[PDB]
Structure formats: structure tokens, C-alpha cells
């Protein structure tokens, strides 16, 4: 158990990956 544990806490790998995603030079509401 890493959650809430000062001996082990760290993000899950999928949370570390969610921060790598990119939407640079895209915009989906431009028509409005």
C-alpha cells in the first residue's frame, strides 16, 4: 500500500503517464 503511507507513497504509473499526454496546437471549440 503506497497510498497515505510516508514509508512508500508515490504516484501510480498511470498517473505519471496522464501527465505526459499533450494537446499542443489543437483546439476543438474553435467553431464556437
Amino acid at each position: 500500500i503506497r497510498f497515505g503511507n510516508p514509508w512508500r507513497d508515490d504516484y501510480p504509473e498511470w498517473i505519471w503517464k496522464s501527465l505526459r499526454v499533450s494537446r499542443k496546437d489543437k483546439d476543438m471549440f474553435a467553431p464556437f
Binding site: P6, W7, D9, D10, Y11
Partner: protein
Amino acid sequence: QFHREIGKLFASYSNKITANSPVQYVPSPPTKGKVRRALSSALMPVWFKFFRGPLDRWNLAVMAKYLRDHGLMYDDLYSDKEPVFARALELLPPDIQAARFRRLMRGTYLNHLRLYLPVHEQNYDPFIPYMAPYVEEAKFQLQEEEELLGYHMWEGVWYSGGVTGFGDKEPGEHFLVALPNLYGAGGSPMQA
């Protein structure tokens, strides 16, 4: 003559204290009486194994992880609203000072975002004592001023110069000396 008699009392007591003075370092008497030392020594094997041990280990784990998340050192927790530490910071050299400034900036930003650092950024010991040589000097310097100037309750002129008169040396730091002007543009103490 009341005052001279009480003088005599004070003087004799002070002379007793003076006569017992050592001329060299002598180890301090223990902080606890022999009864409590005995009781602690008796209960050590249970108390340290079950309770004190884990408490003192959990504490350091908590502290270390919180400091590493943000990239602070331990001596980054002290303020400069504390006179001794203010002096210590005045005595610092350029490099240490600059690094402290940078770490405080980064810690502020990270606590704003509430994002952990990567674990490879957390590989350092946060509990190095980098302020000690300067805190000891500050303590010396601020102790001598008490000894040589602060030994009496000095008497002053009241509510003059922007200071209350009971000891302050910075203007308008107390309510009864607020609002120094009614017209004009004011001013600042640092530009006098």
C-alpha cells in the same frame, strides 16, 4: 532607611552566589532526579521497544518525506522573524544564501501546484545542519548586548519621535503611534 536595608539583603545574597563560582568548566548536574532516572532505567526494555522506538522512527519518516516532496532542507523551516536567525542570515556567504533563496522559491511553487517531484529528484539527505556555525555566532553576539545594555529597566520620554517611549526603536509599530501624518505624502523610515 528601608532602601539601604533591602540593599543589604540583596548584596549578601549576591556575595554568597559569587563565592561559589568555579574557575573552569564543570559538568552540569543532571536534568532529572535520581528517582525518575531509576524508574526510566527500569522500564526501558518495554518502553523503548514497543512505544518510544517506533514513535521516533515514524517521526523521521514523516519529516523526511514531506521535505523531499518539496525539495526543502530542514533548516529552511526557520523564519527571519526570529532575531537570532535574522543575524545568522546576515552573516551568511553568497552561495549558501542564493541556494536557500532558490529552494524557498521552488517549494512555494510546488506547494501551489500540489504535485510530487520524481523520486530521482528526492535522493538527498534533508537534515544536514548548514546553519549551525552562524546560529552559534548570532547567539554570542545577541547575548553580550543583553549583558552590557539590557541589565536595567531604562526610563524614557513617552510618545515622542514616533515611538511609545517604553523601549521601541522602530516608528509606528504599535497602535497608539499609528497614523503619523494627516496631510502630505508620508515617507518611510528607511529613507531618513
